[PDB]
Amino acid sequence: GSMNCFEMLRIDEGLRLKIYKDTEGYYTIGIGHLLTKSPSLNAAKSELDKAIGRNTNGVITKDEAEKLFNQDVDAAVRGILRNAKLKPVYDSLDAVRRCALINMVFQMGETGVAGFTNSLRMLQQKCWDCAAVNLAKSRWYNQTPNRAKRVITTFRTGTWDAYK
Ligand SMILES: [Zn+2]
């Protein structure tokens, strides 16, 4: 009932409490938290063993991965506020629609979400249904229909309704 960004991106991206591998031969942990592009698993559990504070073998708790996720969004939007097109309209919505933006940011990337120039600015004038249906006309929406429909519904309502 009390949803935050980290949980909704656990619904859509996926949370793993053990170290895995990103799609290019690179370990990860949690929700897309990259450590290094090296094969040294000891360097893996050493970067993890130095970022968490407890020395473990690559397994953490669900509340310690949320820490690293909050770091990842605190740097992600540190990048958003340096992108000229993502900066304006983000400063215009409510917290949950901003999370709906950071989700796509972490899904495709800064220039990826920047491409929806027309779709982004109708959110500024708060044209929820129009920007929603225009966002539904995307290859993004077609290659992963489910998640995109969730994000677009939160762009519409500005609520966590679609994730319950
Ligand atoms: Zn309109």
Question: CATH number, domain at 49?
Answer: 1.10.530.40
The total domain count for the chain is 1
Q: Is residue 132 part of a domain?
A: yes
The vertex-34 CA angle with 86 and 61, nearest 5°, equals: 110
Catalytic residues: 13, 22
Name the experimental technique.
X-ray
C-alpha R_g of the chain:
17
Region label for 32, one of left (φ > 0), alpha (ψ between -120 and 50) or beta (otherwise): left
Distance 61 CA to ligand 1 centre (A): 45
Distance 118 CA to ligand 1 centre (A): 12
Distance 122 CA to ligand 1 centre (A): 7
Domain that holds residue 11: 5-157
Contacts of 141 (CB under 8 A, 6+ apart): 135, 148, 149, 152
Question: What resolution in angstrom units was achieved for this structure?
Answer: 2.8
